[PDB]
Amino acid sequence: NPMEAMDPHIFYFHFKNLRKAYGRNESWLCFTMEVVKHHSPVSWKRGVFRNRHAERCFLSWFADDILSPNTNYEVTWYTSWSPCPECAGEVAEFLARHSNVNLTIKTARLYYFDDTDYQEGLRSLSQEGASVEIMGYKDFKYCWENFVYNDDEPFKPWDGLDYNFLDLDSKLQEILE
């Protein structure tokens, strides 16, 4: 159900943190996962989901095909959009019930509206132990190298990538603090 990588034009189109990209209705989710079964070697998985929100696609695949007893999980998501209010509520409840799953979420953009419900979704996710962060240069470069058919070309950042990170990280710390 998860793709191995996305097309380079699709990456630059959906993971931009500029205002133009706020019209993008699709939500892309790249993930890395360390699977840590007790007294076994660690195994790794990675892949890509697109929106059933991309979040629900990941959790449905995770729960049905991956989750197993006596196993801890270290999961990182790289998302084009931050989780919508309902999205965030599902993930928050999932994590409350699976303490063996640890989740870090890095997002390219926050939300289309600065609604109270979206803020509370993130706070609630953060409350249940998820780490919520904005994607910076290093995270976009990681995704380019690992989740995109980059064809061996270096990542080329877009104008304003770093300025917009500062603005988003500022907004996010005000939500979470």
UniProtKB/Swiss-Prot annotation:
Coiled coil: none annotated. It is found in: Cytoplasm; Cytoplasm, P-body. GO terms for molecular function: cytidine deaminase activity; identical protein binding; RNA binding; zinc ion binding. It is one of seven related genes or pseudogenes found in a cluster, thought to result from gene duplication, on chromosome 22. This is DNA dC->dU-editing enzyme APOBEC-3F. Homodimer. Interacts with APOBEC3G in an RNA-dependent manner. Interacts with AGO1, AGO2 and AGO3. The gene is APOBEC3F. One of its GO terms (cellular component) is P-body. Widely expressed. Highly expressed in ovary. Changing residue 73 to A: Resistant to HIV-1 Vif and reduces Vif binding but is still efficiently incorporated into the virion. The keyword Phosphoprotein does not apply.
